[PDB]
């Protein structure tokens, strides 16, 4: 119900995996973002919670060259800091 307009960098990540809209739901932002890491195979193949994005656009949005998906606050900081809520 609550819609978001993602900022230029976060939008290029969602759009680079096949998403064509500009206003998203939180479910869609999390789907397309998780699909971006899977398509780009950014996850550590053995412990798939670790995400390497040092030479990736995701790293600019994140701040660090790597993160663990278990760090929810850190992931939600990048998500809401790079979107406009309506």
């Amino acid at each position: 119900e609550t819609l978001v307009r993602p900022k230029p960098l976060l939008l290029k990540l969602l759009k680079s995996v096949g998403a064509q809209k500009d206003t998203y739901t939180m479910k869609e932002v999390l789907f397309y973002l998780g699909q971006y890491i899977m398509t780009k195979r950014l996850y550590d193949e053995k412990q798939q919670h670790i995400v390497y994005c040092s030479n990736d656009l995701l790293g600019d949005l994140f701040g660090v060259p790597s993160f663990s998906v278990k760090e929810h606050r850190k992931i939600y900081t990048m998500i809401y800091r790079n979107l406009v809520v309506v």
């Binding site: 939180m26 998780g34 899977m38 798939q48 939600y76």
Partner: peptide, 12 residues
């Protein structure tokens, strides 16, 4: 992918 299960713990 075991990645996807980890990532689903983000939402709702």
């Amino acid at each position: 992918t075991s990645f996807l299960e980890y990532w689903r713990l983000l939402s709702p």
